[PDB]
Ligand SMILES: *[C]C1=C([C])[C]=C2C(=[C]1)N([C][C]([O])[C]([O])[C]([O])[C]OP([O])(=O)OP([O])(=O)O[C][C]1O[C](N3[C]=NC4=C3N=[C]N=C4[N])[C]([O])[C]1[O])C1=NC(=O)[N]C(=O)C1=N2C#C[C][N][C]1[C][C]C2=C1[C]=[C][C]=[C]2
C-alpha cells in the first residue's frame with residue numbers, strides 16, 4: 006500500500022533504480038507486469054542448453070556501469086570466441102578475415118568505404134550526446150531518413166550494402182525507417198563506429214557466466230517481497246497529496262514519487278490523471294521499437310573452429326534470413342552453438358514460418374557460409390521473436406522516425422510532476438544497451454533523491470570508474486584513413 | 500453486464516456501428532472513455548458563439564453516408580460562404596481569385612504546378628483503395644517520404660511551397676514525416692486532388708446546422724442508457740467462452756463480439772489476454788496522429804465580404820501561424836467569424852504561447868492578409884489544441900511514416916478472434932473524415948452480423964445511394980492540363996530539337 010517510491014517495471018533500469026533507492030534507506034516497490042523480471046533480458050534454463058540469453062546478452066569495454074553492478078552481484082564475464090577467422094559472405098562466397106572491419110581490395114571501393122565510416126563519425130562530433138536536437142544541422146539531418154543519407158554518401162553498391170547491414174544490425178529497423186540524425190546520435194553515444202561494431206575491444210566482447218537475466222534476478226533477490234510480479238500498471242493519479250498507482254489486478258499503491266522504467270511508447274498502456282502534458286502525450290505515439298528474432302542453433306561440437314573460423318559471420322544480401330552471427334558456445338567449450346539475428350523486415354516475413362521451417366533455413370544458410378555439411382546436423386534449437394511481446398513492443402530498442410527527435414526529443418526524460426523517467430532510451434551513453442539501462446535508472450533515482458533534498462544537484466549525474474577486469478583501449482586511426490579522399494573528392498582532384 | 504456486442508468508443512464510428520446493430524434487435528453497449536460523445540467531433544455551446552464545431556465539421560459531395568445518417572437523425576446542412584473572392588497570400592502579398600485553384604501566370608511555373616497535381620493523381624490510379632500495399636511500386640513509394648517526392652517532382656520553389664502547404668493542410672504533418680505511398684493513397688481514396696481541395700464541389704462545401712456533434716449526441720439519445728460515459732476500457736479477455744471487457748472504474752462487460760472504434764494507436768491503452776498477434780502488437784506503436792490547433796476568431800461583422808473577400812485564405816510561408824482559413828459565420832449572417840488551422844510543427848511551437856498571445860498573432864496576420872484594420876478588433880475567441888487529448892492523440896487522423904504501410908497495413912482491419920475494427924482509419928473511401936467513420940462502423944457491424952449468420956458475405960461491404968440534397972458534379976480536365984509537358988518534359992523537347 007504505502008512507500009516512498011513506486012518503480013514501474015523490473016528490467017535492468019527499474020531494478021538498478023530500486024536498488025540505489027533501497028540502499029539509501031528508502032521504501033521502494035517495483036511493479037512489474039510479467040511473471041518474471043528482466044524485460045528485454047531473459048535467460049532460459051533447461052537441460053539441453055543449460056542456460057541461454059534470449060534477449061540482451063553482450064557487454065564490453067566502456068560499459069562500466071553494468072560491469073560494476075553485475076560484479077557487485079557476484080557475476081562474472083567471459084570472452085565471446087573470436088580467436089579464429091571471421092567470415093564476410095558477399096554475393097554468395099565466403100571471405101575469411103581477422104580484425105573487426107572486413108578488408109576491401111578494389112581501390113575505388115576502398116575509398117568509398119573508408120570515407121563512409123569516417124563521415125558517420127565526423128557528423129557525430131557535431132551531435133551532443135545529451136541533447137542531439139542541438140546539433141548545428143539538426144533539422145537538416147532529422148528530416149531525412151538514413152537511406153537518403155546512404156544514397157548521397159555511398160558512390161558504390163558494395164559500400165551501400167554493408168552500411169545498410171550495419172544500420173539493420175544496430176537498430177533492427179530499415180534505413181528508410183529511421184532519422185539520419187537519430188541514428189548518427191545513436192552510434193556516437195556508444196563511442197563511434199569502431200567501438201560499437203567490435204567484438205574484441207567493443208560492445209560485443211563478453212557475456213555473463215550463467216545469463217544476463219541474473220542481474221535482475223539477483224536484485225529481486227536483494228529486494229525480497231518489494232518486487233511485485235504480475236502487476237501491470239494501468240493508472241496513475243497525481244491530483245492529490247500523494248501519487249496513486251493502480252495495477253490491473255486492482256491493487257493500489259501510494260508514493261511520494263514514481264519512476265517509469267519501461268519503453269517510452271509503453272507509457273501508452275497507462276491512463277493518466279491529470280492528462281499528460283501535450284508534448285509527451287503525442288511523443289509516446291511516435292516512438293516504436295525494432296524488430297528482431299534472436300535464434301540459437303546447437304551442435305555436437307563447435308565444428309567451425311576446426312576450419313579456423315570463430316563463428317562470426319557477416320552475411321550480405323536479401324536471400325539470407327540472418328545477417329550476422331556469433332559463436333554461442335559456453336566458455337568451457339561445450340553446448341556448442343551459433344547465435345544469429347533475423348533483423349527488421351526479415352523478422353516480419355519469416356515469422357509466418359513454423360519454428361522448424363526457420364531452423365532449416367538457418368542451417369542451410371550456415372552450411373553455405375561455413376562450407377560444412379556439419380551445419381545441417383543441429384541437436385537443439387531455441388529462438389525468441391521479440392515483436393510479439395506486449396510489455397516490450399520489440400527489440401533491441403526504440404528508434405525515432407523522420408522529424409520526431411528534434412520535435413519531441415527534449416520531452417523524453419523531462420519529469421511529469423512527481424513521475425521521473427528511466428529506461429535505456431533516456432540514457433546518454435550506450436542508450437539501447439544494458440549499460441544505458443543502469444545509467445538511466447541510477448540517474449532517475451538520484452533525481453528523486455535530489456528532489457527530496459538528500460543530495461545536491463551536481464550529484465544527479467555521476468561518472469563511473471573504468472572496470473579493471475574489462476579495461477578499454479583507445480580508438481586509433483591511421484594517417485591515410487584520416488586523409489584519403491572520398492570518391493567525389495578524387496573526382497574533384499581529377 | 501451482458502449483451503451481444505460491446506463497442507469501444509462513441510465517436511461517429513462507434514455510434515454508427517451501435518445504431519446498425521441495435522436496429523437489427525441486437526443488444527449493444529457503447530463504452531466511451533470521456534464524459535461526452537462525438538470524440539474528434541466536438542460542438543461547443545455558449546452565449547457568445549451560440550454553437551461552434553471545434554473538431555470535425557466539414558462535409559460535401561461524394562460523402563453520402565454521413566449525409567444520409569445525419570439526415571435520418573433530422574439534421575440539415577448549409578453551404579460554407581464562398582460567394583466572393585478567395586485569397587492566396589504568398590511572399591507577403593495577397594492575390595485574390597475565384598475557383599478552387601489559385602491561378603499561376605508564369606508559363607514555366609504553370610507547367611510545374613500543372614504536372615505536380617496531375618502526377619499526384621496519376622500515381623493514385625496505381626494504388627488500390629482497399630489494399631494500397633498492392634500498388635505495383637508500393638515498396639519504392641512507401642520507403643520515401645512525401646518530401647523526397649516533392650524535391651524530385653517540383654522544378655520550381657513556387658510549386659514545392661504550395662505542395663508542402665497542401666500536405667501540411669491535409670494530414671497535419673510535415674512532408675518529411677510521412678510516406679509518399681500513404682499520402683498518395685490518402686488523396687486518392689478521397690477522390691483525387693480536385694475533389695479533396697474544393698469548397699464548392701469538394702469536401703469543404705458544407706457544415707451541419709447546429710454542429711457536427713449532434714450526430715453522436717442524437718445517436719446517444721436513440722440508444723438510451725446503453726451508452727456508458729466515463730468508461731475507458733483497460734482490459735480485453737478472449738480466453739473463455741464469451742469476450743470480457745473491463746473498464747477503468749472496475750465495471751465488467753460480457754459480449755459475443757467487440758468492436759474497437761478508437762484511433763489504431765489508442766489500442767495501446769488496452770491490455771490484452773491473450774496477447775495481440777505480433778503484427779498488430781507492433782502496428783499500434785507505429786501509427787501516430789497529426790498535430791493541429793483549430794482556431795475561431797469572432798467579429799462584429801463579416802467585414803471581409805464588403806471588400807469582396809469570402810473568407811478563404813491560403814497563406815504561404817513560415818512566419819504565418821495559420822496556413823488556411825474559412826468564413827465561419829452562421830448561415831443567418833450573424834456570429835461573424837474566421838476559422839483557421841495551426842498545422843503540424845506550428846502547433847507544437849505556438850502551444851508554448853498563451854491563449855491571448857495566439858489571438859494577437861492571428862488577428863495581426865488576418866489584418867495583413869485582408870488588408871483590414873477591423874481584423875484587429877475581435878469580439879470573442881475559441882480554440883482547440885487536439886494534440887493534448889489523451890483519448891484522441893491528435894487530429895485530424897492517423898498518418899503512416901516511411902516503411903510502415905506496406906509492412907503493417909494489412910493488419911489494420913483484420914479481426915483478432917472476436918474483435919472487429921472500425922474508426923475512420925479503417926475506411927476505404929474518405930478515410931480521415933466523418934464519412935470514413937460511418938463507412939467503417941457500419942462495415943464492422945455487418946462483419947459481426949455475418950459472423951452470426953444473419954447476412955451473407957456479399958452484404959458486408961455495401962454501396963451508398965447519392966445524396967439528393969448534396970449531389971456531386973464529376974471531375975473534369977481540360978485538354979492542355981492533361982497534355983502539357985512537365986518542366987523536364989519541356990527540357991527533353993528542347994534537347995531533342997538541337998542535340
Ligand atoms: C530484445 C533484445 C535482443 C534480442 C538483443 C539485444 C537486446 C534486446 N539489447 C537491449 C537490452 O536488452 C535492453 O537495452 C535493456 O534490457 C533495457 O532494459 P530497460 O530499459 O530496463 O527496459 P526493459 O528491460 O524492457 O524492462 C522494462 C520492464 O517493464 C515492464 N513493463 C512494461 N509495461 C509495464 C511494465 N510493468 C508494469 N506495468 C506496465 N504497464 C516490462 O514487463 C519489463 O520487464 C542488448 N543490450 C545489451 O547491452 N547487449 C546486448 O547484446 C543486447 N542484445 C543485443 C545487442 C546486439 N548488439 C549487436 C551485435 C552486433 C552489433 C550490435 C550492435 C551494433 C553493432 C554490431
Ligand SMILES: *[C]C1=C([C])[C]=C2C(=[C]1)N([C][C]([O])[C]([O])[C]([O])[C]OP([O])(=O)OP([O])(=O)O[C][C]1O[C](N3[C]=NC4=C3N=[C]N=C4[N])[C]([O])[C]1[O])C1=NC(=O)[N]C(=O)[C@@]13=N2C3#C[C][N][C]1[C][C]C2=C1[C]=[C][C]=[C]2
Pocket residue numbers: 507508509510511512513530531532533536537538539540553554555556557558668669695696703730731732733760761762765768769791793823885890891893894895896921922923924931932933934935936
Ligand atoms: C480533430 C479534428 C479537426 C480539428 C478537424 C477535422 C477533423 C478532426 N476531422 C476528422 C474527423 O473528426 C474524424 O475523422 C472523425 O470524427 C472520426 O471519428 P471516429 O472514427 O469515430 O474516432 P473518434 O472521433 O476519435 O471517436 C472514438 C472515441 O473513442 C474513445 N476512446 C478512446 N480510447 C478509449 C475510448 N473509449 C473507451 N476506452 C478507451 N480506451 C474516444 O474518447 C472517442 O470518443 C474532420 N473530418 C471531416 O469529415 N470533416 C472535417 O471538417 C474534419 N475536420 C476537418 C477537416 C479539414 N479538412 C481540410 C480543410 C481544407 C482541406 C482539408 C483537407 C484536405 C484538403 C483541403
